């Protein structure tokens, strides 16, 4: 979000040591914030509410009567950013037995996140099992098999054209025999939504009943990323989100509009291509970081 932070810390910086600014120094800065949000590809409705929330909250803080208005703005923009990102952190509820679907498009970081998610929980005392659920592309299963060997987590590859009921049986037996307590199913990912695959997807969810359905979204595809969320949600049912490639995220509209566009919380974030690159999402932390704090 290099760009956004830079210009945002600027607009704020453009107020220090000025004393009590008027409703014209303000009006100036707010638009600046609005333009910053736009050049970051933030949803236009989010951008509107955001700017409004800053006008509203700042006046409530008598910015016009403050002797340090830059600290008020910084403060309201901070909360506006924390809210937009999701507010307080959120992590799936870890039960005794967990079966989660990782869904998304090919290249979203979905296969890699399934293996990072496994690695993450393994270090948390969980006993995961990776499941490569693509019944049409051996290579896709193969990719997860290698990813799994590298993070030291077992991988079950479904068979070509294998039925959900079959998959269920095999996964549960391996889970049983290996005391797996966190099951991660990397579903089929394609360059674009496939109606038939969506059907096989919903069906698979129907047979296996995951407690969580996490949609993996590449943060670098801006506003587009979220347009794919409504389809998955509609035809399958998403419980949370994972925003990958935040470390390559120039701009940042995706992450900032996600909670508004999707209505789902971001549990995890991809912050490096490294195995440990995946971490729980902290809206508060990301907000403070954007404002340089
Ligand atoms: N820098 C960075 N790279 C990532 C992140 N998540 C995934 N990747 C990389 O993005 C590419 C796409 O991953 P994935 O969708 O799993 O693979 P594909 O389906 O085979 O294209 C891989 O090269 C991953 O290493 C992330 O958070 N940061």
What DSSP letter does each residue of 80-125 carry, written as one string?
Answer: HHHHHHTSS-------SSEEEEEEE-TTTTHHHHHHHHHHHHHTTT
Containing domain of residue 227, as a range? 90-280
- Of the candidates 185, 113, 180, the residue with the CA atom closest to the CA atom of residue 147: 113
Same domain, yes or no, for 21 and 128?
no
Does 288 map to a domain?
A: no
Residue to mutate (ligand 1; options 103, 109, 117; most atoms within 8 A of CB): 109
CA distances from 217 to 8, 93, 105, 132 (A): 25, 21, 8, 18
Task: Write out the two tokens for 183.
Answer: 């099951």
129 bridge partner residues: 183
Count H helices, E strands: the chain?
11, 8
Total domain count for the chain?
Answer: 2
116 C-beta closer than 6 A to ligand 1:
no
Task: Write out the two tokens for 55.
Answer: 């006008």
Exposure of 46 in the CB half-sphere (CA atoms within 13 A):
27
Does 148 map to a domain?
A: yes
Query: Of the residues 89, 106, 126, which one is the last residue of a structural domain?
Result: 89
Coil, helix or strand at residue 193: coil
Does 143 map to a domain?
A: yes
Phi, psi of 183 (to 5 degrees): -105, 125
Please tell me the distance from the alpha carbon of residue 32 to that of residue 123, in angstroms, as a whole number. Answer: 44
Does 216 map to a domain?
A: yes
Q: Whose CA is nearest to atom 26 of ligand 1?
A: 245
Task: Write out the two tokens for 88.
Answer: 């307080």
Same domain, yes or no, for 170 and 260?
yes
For 290, counting Cβ atoms within 10 Å of its Cβ (0-12 exposed, 13-18 middle, 19+ buried), the class is: buried
Does 292 map to a domain?
A: no
Same domain, yes or no, for 71 and 143?
no
276 C-beta closer than 6 A to ligand 1:
no
Structure determination technique employed: X-ray
Please tell me the distance from the alpha carbon of residue 250 to that of residue 221, in angstroms, as a whole number. Answer: 10
Query: Of the residues 35, 69, 89, which one is the last residue of a structural domain?
Result: 89
Same domain, yes or no, for 46 and 126?
no
Task: Write out the two tokens for 232.
Answer: 């998955």
Ligand 1 atom closest to 111 (CA): 16
100 with 273: CB under 8 angstroms?
Answer: no
Query: Of the residues 89, 124, 150, which one is the last residue of a structural domain?
Result: 89
Same domain, yes or no, for 65 and 153?
no
């Amino acid at each position: 979000f290099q760009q956004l932070s830079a210009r945002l810390q600027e607009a704020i910086g453009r107020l220090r040591g000025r004393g009590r600014i008027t409703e014209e120094d303000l009006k100036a800065t707010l638009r600046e914030i609005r333009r910053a949000l736009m050049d970051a590809d933030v949803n236009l409705e989010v951008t509107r509410d955001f700017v409004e929330r800053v006008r509203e909250e700042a006046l409530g803080k008598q910015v016009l009567e403050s002797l340090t208005p830059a600290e008020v703005i910084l403060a309201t923009v901070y909360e506006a950013l924390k809210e937009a990102l999701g507010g307080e952190a959120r992590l799936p509820v870890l039960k005794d037995r967990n079966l989660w679907f990782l869904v998304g498009l090919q290249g979203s970081g979905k296969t890699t996140t399934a293996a990072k998610l496994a690695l993450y929980y393994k270090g948390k005392g969980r006993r995961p099992l990776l499941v490569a659920a693509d019944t049409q592309r051996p290579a896709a299963r193969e990719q997860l098999r290698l990813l799994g060997e590298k993070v030291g987590v077992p991988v079950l590859e479904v068979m070509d054209g294998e039925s959900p009921e079959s998959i269920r049986r095999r996964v549960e037996e391996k889970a049983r025999l290996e005391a797996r307590d966190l099951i991660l199913v990397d579903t089929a990912g394609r360059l674009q939504i496939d109606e038939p695959l969506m059907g096989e997807l919903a069906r698979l969810k129907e047979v296996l009943g995951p407690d969580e359905v996490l949609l993996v979204l590449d943060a670098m595809t801006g506003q587009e990323a979220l347009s794919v969320a409504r389809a998955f949600d509609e035809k399958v049912g998403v419980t949370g989100l994972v925003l990958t490639k935040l470390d390559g995220d120039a701009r940042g509209g995706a992450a900032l509009s996600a909670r508004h566009v999707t209505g789902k919380p971001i549990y995890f974030a991809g912050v490096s291509e490294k195995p440990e690159g995946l971490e729980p999402f902290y809206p508060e932390r990301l907000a403070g970081r954007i404002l340089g704090m």
